[PDB]
UniProtKB/Swiss-Prot annotation, chain A:
The 26S proteasome consists of a 20S proteasome core and two 19S regulatory subunits. The 20S proteasome core is a barrel-shaped complex made of 28 subunits that are arranged in four stacked rings. The two outer rings are each formed by seven alpha subunits, and the two inner rings are formed by seven beta subunits. The proteolytic activity is exerted by three beta-subunits PSMB5, PSMB6 and PSMB7. It comes from Mus musculus (Mouse). Its main location: cytoplasm. The gene is Psma4. Detected in liver (at protein level). The modification N6-acetyllysine is found at residues 126, 175. GO terms for biological process: ubiquitin-dependent protein catabolic process. Component of the 20S core proteasome complex involved in the proteolytic degradation of most intracellular proteins. This complex plays numerous essential roles within the cell by associating with different regulatory particles. Associated with two 19S regulatory particles, forms the 26S proteasome and thus participates in the ATP-dependent degradation of ubiquitinated proteins. It is found in: Cytoplasm; Nucleus. InterPro entries: Ntn_hydrolases_N, Proteasome_alpha, Proteasome_alpha-type, Proteasome_asu_N, Proteasome_bsu_CS, Proteasome_sua/b. The modification Phosphoserine is found at residues 12, 74, 172. This is Proteasome subunit alpha type-4. Belongs to the peptidase T1A family.
From Swiss-Prot, chain C:
Its EC number is 3.4.25.1. GO terms for cellular component: cilium; cytosol; nuclear body; nucleoplasm; proteasome core complex; proteasome core complex, beta-subunit complex. Belongs to the peptidase T1B family. Keywords: Cytoplasm, Hydrolase, Nucleus, Protease, Proteasome, Threonine protease, Zymogen. It catalyses: Cleavage of peptide bonds with very broad specificity. It comes from Mus musculus (Mouse). It is an enzyme of class 3 (hydrolase). One of its GO terms (molecular function) is threonine-type endopeptidase activity. The active site is at 1 (nucleophile). The lineage of its organism: Eukaryota, Metazoa, Chordata, Craniata, Vertebrata. This is Proteasome subunit beta type-7.
From Swiss-Prot, chain D:
NCBIfam families: PRK03996.1 (NF003075). One of its GO terms (cellular component) is nuclear matrix. It holds the Pfam family Proteasome_A_N. It comes from the Eukaryota. The lineage of its organism: Eukaryota, Metazoa, Chordata, Craniata, Vertebrata. This is Proteasome subunit alpha type-6. Component of the 20S core proteasome complex involved in the proteolytic degradation of most intracellular proteins. This complex plays numerous essential roles within the cell by associating with different regulatory particles. Associated with two 19S regulatory particles, forms the 26S proteasome and thus participates in the ATP-dependent degradation of ubiquitinated proteins. PROSITE patterns: PROTEASOME_ALPHA_1 (PS00388), PROTEASOME_ALPHA_2 (PS51475). It comes from Mus musculus. Detected in liver (at protein level). GO terms for biological process: positive regulation of canonical NF-kappaB signal transduction; proteolysis involved in protein catabolic process; skeletal muscle tissue development; ubiquitin-dependent protein catabolic process. The modification Phosphoserine is found at residues 16, 62-63. Keywords: Acetylation, Cytoplasm, Glycoprotein, Nucleus, Phosphoprotein, Proteasome.
From Swiss-Prot, chain G:
GO terms for biological process: proteolysis involved in protein catabolic process. Keywords: Acetylation, Cytoplasm, Hydrolase, Nucleus, Phosphoprotein, Protease, Proteasome, Threonine protease, Zymogen. GO terms for molecular function: threonine-type endopeptidase activity. It is found in: Cytoplasm; Nucleus. Its EC number is 3.4.25.1. This is Proteasome subunit beta type-6. The keyword Cytoplasm applies. The 26S proteasome consists of a 20S proteasome core and two 19S regulatory subunits. The 20S proteasome core is a barrel-shaped complex made of 28 subunits that are arranged in four stacked rings. The two outer rings are each formed by seven alpha subunits, and the two inner rings are formed by seven beta subunits. The proteolytic activity is exerted by three beta-subunits PSMB5, PSMB6 and PSMB7. The modification Phosphothreonine is found at residue 35. It is an enzyme of class 3 (hydrolase). The gene is Psmb6. Component of the 20S core proteasome complex involved in the proteolytic degradation of most intracellular proteins. This complex plays numerous essential roles within the cell by associating with different regulatory particles. Associated with two 19S regulatory particles, forms the 26S proteasome and thus participates in the ATP-dependent degradation of ubiquitinated proteins. It catalyses: Cleavage of peptide bonds with very broad specificity. GO terms for cellular component: cytosol; mitochondrion; nucleoplasm; proteasome core complex; proteasome core complex, beta-subunit complex.
Length: 248, 238, 220, 244, 233, 233, 202, 244
């Protein structure tokens, strides 16, 4: 029995978890996913990996998941393990709504799932979830927020972050253009396209390869929408003309 | 080489090494002698001391009014089996009122010790016991091993250098049946003396005696109570 | 509640009323009491209305799971044994009085299942509040091996007898005819009762009710 | 690669680099460890089972040594492989057959009995805790609606209906013998189906065996009850073979 | 007496790939070819039913299995593992009907089936399935087609191919498949995609085909397969 | 790699033998049994002058009549002492009397080989306690001292030393101790041997002294009364 | 409810009424209380209709599986013991009065009685149910030792006819069953076929 | 036929050639233990086990290899005596549960099947090891008559007229072949059983042995009893005289 055991919840000589770090390698192969914060709203931008001629396209989104009335998340890593985690996030958000009769704060929902992901790394002898999650939402305590999640159960509140393929190069590119406390949603969408175009395997950029979703508070209500192809096409062309205007 | 880690793994020769390694625990502990007559059963045990400042280890333990044991091996495994033997004797006196026969109790040990020798992640009881008991059939001397196999013996000695004691008991086996209580015990110490080297002999501090039978209940003699038995000893035969 | 079943030359005719009452007040005028089990077996229901629905739907769910694994049409004895064993385990706490009737490979089979878990195989059975009035029609006019139209007339008269004579039953007569090749689910077979139309309407004039606060919310 | 190994793919029931289950593949070789061959042939009137009855010494009681088993009054089977695993699958088959009649009212079909055993043996294939059963069950019996049925389940979990089947050491050789008989149009009667089954075990193994060396079990339309022929009736079929 | 392993058998490699899932995807690739095409008017599923011995009874065991009145399944890879997925899909479809009193949406059933397939890649002492599934259905006046792999991921397809030479199937599909095809035309192009990788003549016993529309899902009888197979319609 | 309950070719468990080796790295402790009481001495071993010396407690009271000194892994010891404190109060609740020193030691000795992987509770022990203990107290039999080790073998001792320099301190106790010595000589002798085995010089805020006598209850020596016996170097 | 089983040299003769009442109303006047368990083993049901039918189906499942494991024709004592274990263990939950009678190649004709308590005893003749109380006087006086098959058929029919006459819970149709080495043969006594007994009038 | 690394460590693991070595090594444990014989006669069964004396200090009757499963059932064991006693307790409980449910003495053919299923259940898992012992069962009644069964570490049960298990099982079986146990009375069998053990016993490899015999037939009215001092020594006298 112990001969066939892989030993997942065990420390290494250097003081680190192997199965967690190997799960971190799994996310680095997945599609590029970035989310950035603005003054009037907050948005997510993800690289769609499911690209084929004979795909049906039924769902509203591929990697953007709706969790709450005021909250949404994005996925980087294994799609199957993500479907379990996103379903759990929807349950925790509803348990809080049943108990307190008010929407769950953004930080409380992120920490709740990260407690479960930490449990898998400490006890159980099972493989950890190889999924990194980017959360966007609004609460009455702090407002518009952005969060990053790790397989170890590690969370962090960001203003501009990226996870997935070419994550190290993209986060440095986001560090170059971002302006603190002055960025609007209009300039944020232009910044997101700028990063995705440069940090990608197949360049030029088409509407089918990318997926952008926005979260904005309108008339005292949170509005979460996935931008359609025609809306995305305009954002690419606005950056495409900026490429031509650069040579002058 | 790789078959000596678990009890569940069988050797290509048709053996279990983990049970055989558990038997080595009995051989490392000090020797104890168990013999019987027609009316009495006596346990004579040799005590060990890690240092001269520390007292000698307890070797004979109580089980019931008619049953007693002398252990050889692990101390914690000895007390764990002793508590089981005490509980089974209490259950018989609670339900049937009568004292539980020795043959019944030894069979219960052979049932409990068999369980962990077959399951994964479980170990055999690394302790050998010599059981002295008296029922309505006479005196009894029983030998239990780390393996569930038990022995009904006339005289037996198990432990460190117990082979020398085993040879003495074999030459005087026919004498035991018609022996007096005082003489029966003297045969026990003389066997226990053979285990020790010619440099040292038996004293009041390292000898424990447990006697049970028709005349009296099980009683353990330790320091000043063991001295009437030691006095009148035949001199050391090197 | 008046439910009945019959066995004729070809198949089975099942009957039911449409009155559902809360105490001594009519709650539903048009209520379905003949329930779907399988494309060949149907079951009438009586007793506790909530218990009747959920007991039927569970066995119908299990038999659809059973028929697709076997690859052939489910048997009436399979529907009977499932209802018999499940109701027995609850010791009659689930108040479900059922009349099982379906056409099988073996032939026509009619059963009557009691809430405690007792089953009776008979050519004709009556269950519910007006079961005594319905049985009286069968014990007087029933004959072995009948025609389809002759069997349909007998059950309709049996249900109607429970409708007029029993206070617990009323309104429309529902019939379900199942044969070896044909399945007729006549929902309104006979409507003996009719409401006297309102000759003098008391329609409230526009703006006769006093309003304190008004709020209008637009929709997409 | 064709024959590659990684990790513990040959010790526990897990996938190999190619996508093959080695432990499951070794279970088929455990069937051939018994040194016996079973042949099943289906006719228009009956289903026939024939198997070797090896008695190495006179010390053994011949009546007790049998691979023919009764599950229901209408359903019988034969076991090929490890006898310890064989009896365990029979006792489970007897349980599933009785439970079907209790829960569903009517008697279990041969099609559903073989499917149930195949689903149980699938659990061994997916779980690493236990090894798959090193035995093979060939079920016979008449469905009261379709007719005679012959089914066979694998340690892998594969179940299928058959016109003619074989299992054991001489499995692949005897299956080729049945193919030649099926290709040609035959009038499959009671005597025709039995004689084809016996000759198959007599040509491949090349023995020309005695009535005490084989065991035969038939299920006919007139008698749906499972019956063993015994030495008195088996000899009658054997003496009739040496005629043409 | 038994216990059961609590540790996972599927673990992450130093590279970052799940070793057991990729080998399970290798197991499905070495199976019989299976095709599924949505036609906006109906759904068609066809698979290779090669028996390669004649002695086997062809009508006894089916590869195309119905789940409910409107949903069916076609697979590639291992047979025994598929059968357990059928019973589980049938039970999950009935659990939805008992609660909501409405025929289960195709998109919803696939989510529930893939969730079970995800478990066996993370649960203690179990290997993943060596089966990829093609789920068809009809609800809200719209046809549906999905694909669920050993990993637990699900994809929506217009037309796709599985089994051996799936790369040759999809390339032939994107060359032949067109939007707004009739149900009868969908069967013709589905039975032709299976001919791409087959060898050894097609007979009514050699392949198995099932259709799904507004009337519901049903398996086509060997008589109906016979007419759609004799070269012409 | 092997299981926790694995026997050696020698005839003993591995995990138990390694737990004995764990004590040899811990701090030294000396206990002496006298006719008029039992004294316990232990080094605090302060790593940094910033750390509070009063926080380091290696001698703790189980009851008002029994004290206990610990060596090796301090963290594991506090679990054993806490269990011993409950057992004394459980016996007090049931029998309305104080437990004997031998009985308290036997109660802790029952938790010796209660470690294992299979056939155990979800929150059971996986490894033995790497702690050597010195149970010193006064009952109706008089002043007694007991020694316990990871194996669970408990025995009465006149003078016992456990820790890093266990071999050096024991040899010094063998040439000084006799049956008819006084308690003041027992405290004096223990301190002279304690400074010999230490690496850092003996100080008032460096040692712990506790005496249990038939006269009074468990007494912990404060800094002021410690210097009263330190002045006699 | 009236049930009867009489033992003879060849095998057993069974008899049961056809009336099942839910208060004072007949729910079924055609009830078959003779339940087959095996090829030669039958039982007679009395008491709660839900309870008796559930146990009878459970014994059929238990004995059916038992007979195949031993590969031997089942004993009447074995079949009655399975009824005994269920009636005794759940005696506070079940209302059953089962009389088990059949045939086996080892002993022959056997009649066993399992009353409300859960006990088991072998008898030459057995009567149970509500209507059995009225015919205790008749059976004790008419019974002869060593009666033939034909005599036992008349003996059961007469006793049941007198029971249904007086008891309100008993009535309808007499159902008889004769079991021997040959097999099981059943007959149904109708309206005018019933044993005639005069009504005393002034 | 020997695998070193893997395949032979767990009982839930198949070897490349399709064998379970953990069961085979348990069969090697019974080969190292002394021979145990049992011959079925016309009116019962007679058992005979040679008990190797390890030390002269042990009492006569200790380490008994003859057990009473039921009042009519006997048990002769070979192999590891630790596992032999545990299987005896399971056999005793199986016989106890049958009488408690049905009310009559358990048939040997059913008892041998139910215990062998328990023996088999220890050969499929890694959590438990197969029993390292083989045993025999014998009973006599009025209806069933004389019956004898043998169960090996794998879990296989067969009927025997005369079986032997232990050190020299091959040498013992050749001696039973000469005997006419079909026609012989069990009183003459005890005389012949005793002399086989004396011939089989290797007195240059092994030291000394103690003879143990058992009755179960019409002579003891069906009850399994131990052979009295008068008959045992009378058969032991013939065993020594026929040796010359």
């Amino acid at each position: 029995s112990r001969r066939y055991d892989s030993r997942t919840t065990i420390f290494s000589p250097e003081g680190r978890l192997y199965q967690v770090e190997y799960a971190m390698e799994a996310i680095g192969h997945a599609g590029t996913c970035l989310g950035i914060l603005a003054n009037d709203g907050v948005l997510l931008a993800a690289e769609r990996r499911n690209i084929h001629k004979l795909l049906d396209e039924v769902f509203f989104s591929e990697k953007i998941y709706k969790l709450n009335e005021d909250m949404a998340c994005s996925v980087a890593g294994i799609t199957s393990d993500a479907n379990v985690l996103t379903n759990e996030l929807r349950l925790i958000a509803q348990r809080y709504l049943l108990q307190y009769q008010e929407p769950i704060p953004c930080e409380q929902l992120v920490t709740a799932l990260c407690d479960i992901k930490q449990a898998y790394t400490q006890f159980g002898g099972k493989r950890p979830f190889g999924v990194s999650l980017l959360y966007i939402g609004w609460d009455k305590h702090y407002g518009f927020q952005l969060y990053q999640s790790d397989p170890s159960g590690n969370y962090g509140g960001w203003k501009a972050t990226c996870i997935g393929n070419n994550s190290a190069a993209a986060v440095s590119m986001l560090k170059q253009d971002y302006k603190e406390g002055e960025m609007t949603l209009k300039s944020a969408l232009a910044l997101a396209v700028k990063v995705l175009n440069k940090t990608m395997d197949v360049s030029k950029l088409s509407a089918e390869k990318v997926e952008i979703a926005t979260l904005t508070r309108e008339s005292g209500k949170t509005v979460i929408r996935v931008l359609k192809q025609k809306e995305v096409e305009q954002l690419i062309k606005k950056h495409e003309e900026e490429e031509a205007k650069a040579e002058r | 080489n790789q078959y000596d880690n678990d009890v569940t793994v069988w050797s290509p020769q048709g053996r279990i090494h983990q049970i055989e390694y558990a038997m080595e625990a009995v051989k490392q502990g000090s020797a104890t002698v168990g013999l019987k007559s027609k009316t009495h059963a006596v346990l004579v045990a040799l005590k060990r001391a890690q240092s001269e400042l520390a007292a000698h280890q307890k070797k004979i333990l109580h089980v019931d009014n008619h049953i007693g044991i002398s252990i050889a091996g692990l101390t914690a495994d000895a007390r764990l089996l002793c508590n089981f033997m005490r509980q089974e004797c209490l259950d018989s006196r609670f339900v049937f009122d009568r004292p539980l026969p020795v043959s019944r109790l030894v069979s219960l040990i052979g049932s409990k010790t068999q369980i962990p020798t077959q399951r994964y992640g479980r170990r055999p009881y690394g302790v050998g016991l010599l059981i002295a008991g008296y029922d309505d059939m006479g005196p009894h001397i029983f030998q239990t091993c780390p393996s569930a196999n038990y022995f009904d013996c006339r005289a037996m000695s198990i432990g460190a250098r117990s082979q020398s004691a085993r040879t003495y008991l074999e030459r005087h086996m026919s004498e035991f049946m018609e022996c007096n209580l005082d003489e029966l015990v003297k045969h026990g110490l003389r066997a226990l003396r053979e285990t020790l080297p010619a440099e040292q002999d038996l004293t009041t501090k390292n000898v424990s005696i447990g006697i049970v039978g028709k005349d009296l209940e099980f009683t353990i003699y330790d320091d000043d109570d063991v001295s009437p038995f030691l006095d009148g000893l035949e001199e050391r035969p090197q | 509640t008046t439910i009945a079943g019959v066995v004729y030359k070809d198949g089975i005719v099942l009957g039911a009323d449409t009155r559902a009452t809360e105490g001594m007040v009519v709650a539903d005028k048009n209520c379905s009491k003949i329930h779907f089990i399988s494309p060949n077996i149907y079951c009438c229901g009586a007793g506790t209305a909530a218990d009747t629905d959920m007991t039927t739907q569970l066995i119908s769910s299990n038999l659809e799971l059973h028929s697709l694994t076997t690859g052939r049409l489910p048997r009436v004895v399979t529907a009977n044994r499932m209802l018999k064993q499940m109701l027995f385990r609850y010791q009659g706490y689930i108040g479900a009085a059922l009349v099982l009737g379906g056409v099988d490979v073996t032939g026509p089979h009619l059963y009557s299942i009691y809430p405690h878990g007792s089953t009776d195989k008979l050519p004709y059975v009556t269950m519910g509040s007006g079961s005594l009035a319905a049985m009286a029609v069968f014990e007087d006019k029933f004959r072995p091996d009948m025609e389809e139209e002759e069997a349909k007339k007998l059950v309709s008269e049996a249900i109607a007898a429970g409708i007029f004579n029993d206070l617990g039953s009323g309104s429309n007569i529902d019939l379900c005819v199942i044969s070896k090749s044909k399945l007729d689910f006549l929902r309104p077979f006979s409507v003996p009762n009719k409401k006297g139309t309102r000759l003098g309407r008391y329609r409230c004039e526009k703006g006769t009710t006093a309003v304190l606060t008004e709020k209008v919310t637009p929709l997409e | 690669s064709r024959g590659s190994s990684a990790g513990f793919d040959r010790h526990i029931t897990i996938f190999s680099p190619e996508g093959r289950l080695y432990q499951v593949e070794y279970a088929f070789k455990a069937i051939n460890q018994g040194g016996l061959t079973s042949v099943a042939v289906r006719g228009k009137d009956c289903a026939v089972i024939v198997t070797q009855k090896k008695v190495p010494d006179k010390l053994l009681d011949s009546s007790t040594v049998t691979h023919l088993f009764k599950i229901t009054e209408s359903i019988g089977c034969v076991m090929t492989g490890m006898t310890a695993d064989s009896r365990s699958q029979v006792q489970r088959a007897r349980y599933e057959a009785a439970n079907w009649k209790y829960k569903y009212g009517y008697e279990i079909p041969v099609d559903m009995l073989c499917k149930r055993i195949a689903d149980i043996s699938q659990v061994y294939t997916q779980n690493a805790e236990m090894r798959p059963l090193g035995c093979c069950m060939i079920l016979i019996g008449i469905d009261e609606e379709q007719g005679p049925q012959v089914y066979k389940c694998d340690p892998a979990g594969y179940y299928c209906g058959f016109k003619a089947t074989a299992a054991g050491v001489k499995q692949t050789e005897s299956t080729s013998f049945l193919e030649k008989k099926v290709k040609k149009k035959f009038d499959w009667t009671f005597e025709q189906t039995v004689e084809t089954a016996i000759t198959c075990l007599s040509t491949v193994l090349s023995i020309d065996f005695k009535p005490s060396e084989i065991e035969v079990g038939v299920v006919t339309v007139e008698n749906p009850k499972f019956r063993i022929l015994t030495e008195a009736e088996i000899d009658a079929h054997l003496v009739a073979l040496a005629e043409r | 007496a038994k216990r059961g392993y609590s540790f996972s058998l599927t673990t992450f490699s130093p590279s970052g790939k799940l070793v057991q899932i990729e080998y399970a995807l290798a197991a499905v690739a070495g199976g019989a070819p299976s095709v599924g095409i949505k036609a906006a008017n109906g759904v068609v599923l066809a698979t290779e039913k090669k028996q390669k011995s004649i002695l086997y009874d062809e009508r006894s065991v089916h590869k195309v299995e119905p789940i409910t009145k409107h949903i069916g399944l076609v697979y590639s890879g291992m047979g025994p593992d598929y059968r357990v997925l059928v019973h589980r899909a049938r039970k999950l479809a009935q659990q939805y009907y008992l609660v909501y009193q409405e025929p289960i949406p195709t998109a919803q059933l696939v989510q529930r089936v893939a969730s079970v397939m995800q478990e066996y890649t993370q649960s203690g002492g179990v290997r993943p399935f060596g089966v990829s599934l093609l789920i068809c259905g009809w609800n809200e006046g719209r046809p549906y087609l999905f694909q669920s792999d050993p990993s637990g991921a699900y994809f929506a397809w217009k037309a796709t191919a599985m089994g051996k030479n799936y790369v040759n199937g999809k390339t032939f599909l994107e060359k032949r498949y067109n939007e707004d095809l009739e149900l009868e035309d969908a069967i013709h192009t589905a039975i032709l995609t299976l001919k791409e990788s087959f060898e050894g003549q097609m007979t009514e016993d050699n392949i198995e085909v099932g259709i799904c529309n507004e009337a519901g899902f049903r398996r086509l009888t060997p008589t109906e397969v016979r007419d759609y197979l004799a070269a012409i319609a | 790699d092997r299981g926790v309950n694995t026997f050696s070719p020698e005839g003993r468990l591995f995990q138990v033998e390694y737990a004995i080796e764990a004590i040899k790295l811990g701090s030294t402790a000396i206990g002496i049994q006298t006719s008029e009481g039992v004294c316990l001495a232990v080094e605090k071993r302060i790593t940094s002058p910033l750390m509070e010396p009063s926080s380091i407690e290696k001698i703790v009271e189980i009851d008002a009549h029994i004290g206990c000194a610990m060596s090796g892994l301090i963290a594991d010891a506090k679990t054993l002492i806490d269990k011993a404190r409950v057992e004394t109060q459980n016996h007090w609740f049931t029998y309305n009397e104080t437990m004997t020193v031998e009985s308290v030691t036997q109660a802790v000795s029952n938790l010796a080989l209660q470690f294992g992987e299979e056939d155990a509770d979800p929150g059971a022990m996986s490894r033995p306690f790497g702690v050597a203990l010195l149970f010193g107290g006064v009952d109706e039999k008089g002043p007694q001292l007991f020694h316990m080790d990871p194996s669970g073998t408990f025995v009465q001792c006149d003078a016992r030393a456990i820790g890093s320099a266990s071999e050096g301190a024991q040899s010094s106790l063998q040439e000084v101790y006799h049956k008819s010595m006084t308690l003041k000589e027992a405290i004096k002798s223990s301190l002279i041997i304690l400074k010999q085995v230490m690496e850092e010089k003996l100080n008032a805020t460096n040692i712990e002294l506790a005496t249990v006598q038939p006269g009074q209850n468990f007494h912990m020596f404060t800094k002021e009364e410690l210097e009263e016996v330190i002045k006699d170097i | 409810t009236t049930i009867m089983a009489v033992q003879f040299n060849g095998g057993v003769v069974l008899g049961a009424d056809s009336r099942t009442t839910t208060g004072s109303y007949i729910a079924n006047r055609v009830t078959d209380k003779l339940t087959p368990i095996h090829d030669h083993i039958f039982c007679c049901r009395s008491g709660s209709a839900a309870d008796t039918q559930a146990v009878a189906d459970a014994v059929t499942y238990q004995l059916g599986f038992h007979s195949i494991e031993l590969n031997e024709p089942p004993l009447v004592h074995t079949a009655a013991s399975l009824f005994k274990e269920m009636c005794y263990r759940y005696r506070e939950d079940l209302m059953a009065g089962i009389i088990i009678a059949g045939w086996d190649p080892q002993e022959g004709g056997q009649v066993y009685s399992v009353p409300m308590g859960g006990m088991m005893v072998r008898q030459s003749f057995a009567i149970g149910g509500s209507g059995s109380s009225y015919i205790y006087g008749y059976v004790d006086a008419t019974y002869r030792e060593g009666m033939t098959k034909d005599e036992c058929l008349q003996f059961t029919a007469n006793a049941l006819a007198l029971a249904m006459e007086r008891d309100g819970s008993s009535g309808g149709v007499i159902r008889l069953a004769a079991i021997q080495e040959s097999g099981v043969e059943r007959q149904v006594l109708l309206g005018d076929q019933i044993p005639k007994f005069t009504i005393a009038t002034l | 036929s020997s695998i070193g690394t893997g395949y032979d460590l767990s009982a839930s693991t198949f070897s490349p050639d399709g064998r379970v070595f953990q069961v085979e090594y348990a069969m090697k444990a019974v080969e190292n233990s002394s021979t145990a014989i049992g011959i079925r006669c016309k009116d019962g069964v007679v058992f005979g086990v040679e008990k190797l004396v390890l030390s002269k200090l042990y009492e006569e009757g200790s380490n008994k290899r003859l057990f009473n499963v039921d009042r009519h059932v006997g048990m002769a064991v070979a192999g590891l005596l630790a596992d032999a006693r545990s299987l005896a307790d399971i056999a005793r409980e199986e016989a106890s549960n049958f009488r408690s449910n049905f009310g009559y003495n358990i048939p040997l053919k059913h008892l041998a099947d139910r215990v062998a299923m328990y023996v088999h259940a220890y050969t499929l898992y890694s959590a438990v090891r197969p029993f390292g012992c083989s045993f025999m069962l014998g009973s006599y009644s009025a209806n069933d008559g004389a019956q004898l069964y043998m169960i090996d570490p794998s879990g296989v049960s067969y009927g025997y007229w005369g079986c032997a298990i232990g050190k020299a099982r091959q040498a013992a079986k050749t001696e039973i072949e000469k005997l006419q146990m079909k026609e012989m009375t069990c009183r003459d069998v005890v005389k012949e059983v005793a002399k086989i053990i004396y011939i089989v016993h290797d007195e240059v490899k092994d030291k000394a042995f103690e003879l143990e015999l058992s009755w179960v037939g019409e002579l003891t009215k069906g009850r399994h009893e131990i052979v009295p001092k008068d008959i045992r020594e009378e058969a032991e006298k013939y065993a020594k005289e026929s040796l010359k």
